[PDB]
Amino acid sequence: GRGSASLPACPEESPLLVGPMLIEFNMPVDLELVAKQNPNVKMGGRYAPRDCVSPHKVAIIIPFRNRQEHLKYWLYYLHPVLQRQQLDYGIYVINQAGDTIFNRAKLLNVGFQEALKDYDYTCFVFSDVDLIPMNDHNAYRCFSQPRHISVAMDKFGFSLPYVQYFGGVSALSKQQFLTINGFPNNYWGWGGEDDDIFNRLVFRGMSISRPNAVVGTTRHIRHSPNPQRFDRIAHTKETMLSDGLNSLTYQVLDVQRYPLYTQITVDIGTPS
Numbered sequence: 001g002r003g004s005a006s007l008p009a010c011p012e013e014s015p016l017l018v019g020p021m022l023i024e025f026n027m028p029v030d031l032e033l034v035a036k037q038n039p040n041v042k043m044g045g046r047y048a049p050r051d052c053v054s055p056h057k058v059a060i061i062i063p064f065r066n067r068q069e070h071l072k073y074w075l076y077y078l079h080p081v082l083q084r085q086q087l088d089y090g091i092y093v094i095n096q097a098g099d100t101i102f103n104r105a106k107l108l109n110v111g112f113q114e115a116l117k118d119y120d121y122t123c124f125v126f127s128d129v130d131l132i133p134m135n136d137h138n139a140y141r142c143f144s145q146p147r148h149i150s151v152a153m154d155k156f157g158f159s160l161p162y163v164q165y166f167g168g169v170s171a172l173s174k175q176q177f178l179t180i181n182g183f184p185n186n187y188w189g190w191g192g193e194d195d196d197i198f199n200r201l202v203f204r205g206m207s208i209s210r211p212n213a214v215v216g217t218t219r220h221i222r223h224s225p226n227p228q229r230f231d232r233i234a235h236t237k238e239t240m241l242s243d244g245l246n247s248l249t250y251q252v253l254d255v256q257r258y259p260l261y262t263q264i265t266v267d268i269g270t271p272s
């Protein structure tokens, strides 16, 4: 029964999962030690299983500005989890240059476009830097419908704020992201950019996929009021095809590959 053969696909669910994880933010983190403990993660925060081929080619995109301590917690907790999930992944921290109003959604678009320059990713996880999953059965990859990952956050009493809530951590396949023309680029702190994304998905006929809530629990790292759903549905229908990936503009000022992540510092302009 000999002969040259290809590596098998990785299994539907990884056999390496441990389930519940104790998440704490009260100790210091040293990235050199983290890299040493995660020796298989390559420069820029890249990893793929050695013994099987994952159909999950995932770019994990983190919107960022001055949250280095949270990032250190994110990297310390997520790298082991992502490897146990057997993903072919890369970590991208999209750092907003300057001191002007933060624009989360626009940095996420930047992440999608820049991660694609690196590799043919086919799934995109958009994750705030201060959310850590509490159970490794909460898969950080894409499904048949847009995936809402952080479904039961401790900050919201472990309950979904409203059925259309799509914030925190989500995953969209390349096909799913393209068909909604990405995310809006003009939410300069206004709030509700996640509701606009949800409206785009719905208008394109997509629904929300979610892990079972018991394994979808996440911890939020406190830093220096349950959200409510912002309207603007008509707005989204009016503007989604003209404001998004197609109209995205920015300047890349610095690209740094660190052992555990790639950081792209970009100038995304100011509110027009």
Ligand SMILES: O=c1ccn([C@@H]2O[C@H](COP(=O)(O)OP(=O)(O)O)[C@@H](O)[C@H]2O)c(=O)[nH]1
Binding pocket: 062, 063, 064, 065, 066, 067, 102, 104, 127, 128, 129, 130, 131
């Ligand atoms: O100065 C800032 C503001 C926001 N963020 C990123 O944006 C996410 C959400 O921002 P915030 O924690 O203020 O939550 P919001 O209330 O705006 O949902 C954070 O977790 C970070 O990933 C950041 O990096 N720096």
Ligand SMILES: [Mn+2]
Binding pocket: 130, 220, 221, 223
């Ligand atoms: Mn936060």
